[PDB]
Design an enzyme around this catalytic site. Structure first.
Site, PDB file in Angstrom:
ATOM      1  N   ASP A 274      52.692 -63.518  82.421  1.00 39.60           N
ATOM      2  CA  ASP A 274      51.618 -62.727  82.958  1.00 39.60           C
ATOM      3  C   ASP A 274      52.004 -61.268  82.784  1.00 39.60           C
ATOM      4  OD1 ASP A 274      49.988 -61.160  84.566  1.00 39.60           O
ATOM      5  OD2 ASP A 274      50.622 -62.083  86.469  1.00 39.60           O
ATOM      6  N   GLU A 292      46.231 -60.198  82.565  1.00 41.98           N
ATOM      7  CA  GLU A 292      46.577 -60.737  83.910  1.00 41.98           C
ATOM      8  C   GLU A 292      45.331 -61.212  84.680  1.00 41.98           C
ATOM      9  OE1 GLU A 292      48.403 -58.168  87.006  1.00 41.98           O
ATOM     10  OE2 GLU A 292      49.418 -60.027  87.533  1.00 41.98           O
ATOM     11  N   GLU A 293      44.300 -60.372  84.759  1.00 43.71           N
ATOM     12  CA  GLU A 293      43.118 -60.686  85.547  1.00 43.71           C
ATOM     13  C   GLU A 293      42.398 -61.921  84.978  1.00 43.71           C
ATOM     14  OE1 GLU A 293      43.656 -57.564  84.244  1.00 43.71           O
ATOM     15  OE2 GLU A 293      43.646 -56.195  86.082  1.00 43.71           O
TER      16      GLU A 293
END
Ligand SMILES: Cn1c(=O)c2[nH]c(SCCN3CCOCC3)nc2n(C)c1=O
Length: 500
Positions: A274, A292-293
């Site tokens: 991540d 990441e999101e």
């Protein structure tokens, strides 16, 4: 033609095949376990431990919305009772949901806009989709949220800075907590923790957030139609001592590099990176929608790390084992779209965790590009990646390959060729192979492959390579007066080694 170079991805270690036989799951001083281990069975919903709700309201645990200490001004009333009264109403229009959430968030009635929620419901969804939303999905989400005291009976410790600690909890328990987050019920959360309540998902004019909400509702539809049966472990890892990089005599490890594929699809059973914010999950509950999101949306169980994970210091990471993929997507940022529901086919380990391990390692943000060649900054990235990769007390043959790519590139201004070598060095030190996804950049694939095989064939150690990085800084960067150096890093390395 060639879509990948180096060691075949088939020859890389993956879970579950490579894994150790796990020890018996049991609570300990450094392992919070919130289910009945004696009743954990394949395909069965885990039973909470303890049987009755126990509350802690303090600075070392999650402040639960159902705590008797969660009060509101009337004399003091129970905010949990207020939350029940507010949410146990029929929604037929998005205003009705806004009004419900604000009943127990009155201080924010002026401040929290719900434009994006309204647009999602009225202007993005089909009328039949919106109908199913208010007739079925939202009422089921309310019910799982209001079941929290019967589900999450055991206080959840904060993973605070410098703690080396694990929380193993049920997917079902996460679902209850996440439904609370959706309804913005977590008290005292509206500065060293990420946001958990979902209010920023609802606000502002946005095309991204309706797609975010499609992704989250896909999850919530699934886990309210039928409880998920597995467990998830969240581990904060904080290392005290880091390698002496310049003295490290370990060899490089193997590399597979490809411009096609994704960490999540092509790195199944590997240590999946991540590209994190130090506030884990980044802007997932707000505007952010890059690597990441997206991961936190398609595997929403990751979002609950924001409930309990303090901002990462330079020597820390978060390791999450067992999150399930519920969605598929295309695009990213302005082009991100929810595609469809995903049936996760990962095997589960002997703790009933999906064999999916994700590490949140946050790169630095370099506003000045040359700053990242400064030795202290190279060592900082090496040590962060090393902390994310290392598994104290595991043999190397039981370690999956690291599945990663251009960590800290994009918004953070990292140099992809430098970051690839940094991760190669960190992986080598942690005795793991590297599977590297260049995300459509075929030149970068060739470049990383060519450098890796050059250094391997010449049998250079991690130290040898680090020293060459220090040379590059001292000779081309330090006394450099332009934004970029005269000579690029990889050419510099080739010349320095071929000159010997
Ligand atoms: C290897 N890898 C990625 O690099 C990646 N990026 C994204 S979002 C756009 C930003 N990135 C562009 C490439 O530089 C990293 C920043 N999603 C990704 N996924 C799923 C992936 O597997």
């Amino acid at each position: 033609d060639k879509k990948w170079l180096g060691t075949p991805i088939e020859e890389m270690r993956r879970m579950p095949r490579c894994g150790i036989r796990l020890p018996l799951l049991r609570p300990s001083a450094n392992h919070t376990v919130t289910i009945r281990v004696d009743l954990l069975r394949a395909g069965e919903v885990p039973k909470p431990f303890p049987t009755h709700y126990k509350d802690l309201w303090d600075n070392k645990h999650v402040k639960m919305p159902c705590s008797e200490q969660n009060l509101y001004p009337v004399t003091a009333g129970s905010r949990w009772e207020l939350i029940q009264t507010a949410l146990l109403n029929k929604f037929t229009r998005p205003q009705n949901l806004k009004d419900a959430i604000l009943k127990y968030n009155v201080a924010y009635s002026k401040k929290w806009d719900f434009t994006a929620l309204i647009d999602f419901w009225d202007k993005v969804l089909e009328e039949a989709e919106a109908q199913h939303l208010y007739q079925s999905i939202l009422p089921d989400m309310v019910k799982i949220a209001l079941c929290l005291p019967n589900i999450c009976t055991q206080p959840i410790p904060l993973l605070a800075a410098a703690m080396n600690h694990s929380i193993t909890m049920s997917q079902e328990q996460i679902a209850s907590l996440l439904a609370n987050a959706f309804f913005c019920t977590f008290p005292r959360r509206n500065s060293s923790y990420p946001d958990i309540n979902f209010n920023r998902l609802f606000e502002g004019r946005s095309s991204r957030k309706p797609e975010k909400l499609k992704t989250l509702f896909c999850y919530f539809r699934r886990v309210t139609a039928a409880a998920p049966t597995g467990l998830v472990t969240f581990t904060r890892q904080s290392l005290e001592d880091f390698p002496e990089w310049e003295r490290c005599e370990k060899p490089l490890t193997r590399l597979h590099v490809t411009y096609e594929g994704t960490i999540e699809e092509n790195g199944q059973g590997m240590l999946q990176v991540d590209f994190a914010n130090r506030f884990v999950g980044g802007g997932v509950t707000s505007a952010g929608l890059v690597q990441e999101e997206i991961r936190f949306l398609i595997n929403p169980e990751l979002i609950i790390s924001r409930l309990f994970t303090e901002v990462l210091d330079h020597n820390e990471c978060l390791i999450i084992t067992g999150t399930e993929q519920y969605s598929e997507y295309t695009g990213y940022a302005e082009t991100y779209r929810w595609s469809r529901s995903h049936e996760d086919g990962s095997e589960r380990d002997d703790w009933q965790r999906r064999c999916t391990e994700i590490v949140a390692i946050d790169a630095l943000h370099f506003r000045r590009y040359l700053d990242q060649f400064v030795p202290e900054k190279m060592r900082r990235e090496l040590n962060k990646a090393y902390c994310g990769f290392l598994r104290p007390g595991v043999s190397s043959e039981n370690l999956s390959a690291v599945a990663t790519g251009n960590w800290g590139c994009g918004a953070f201004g990292g140099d992809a060729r430098l970051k690839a070598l940094i991760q190669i060095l960190a992986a080598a030190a942690a005795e793991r192979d590297v599977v590297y996804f260049t995300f459509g950049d075929s030149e970068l694939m060739r470049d990383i492959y060519s450098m890796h095989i050059f250094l391997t064939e010449r049998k250079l150690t991690v130290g040898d390579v680090y020293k060459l990085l220090l040379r590059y800084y001292n000779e081309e960067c330090r006394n450099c007066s332009t934004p970029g150096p005269d000579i690029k890093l990889y050419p510099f390395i080739y010349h320095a080694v071929e000159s010997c």
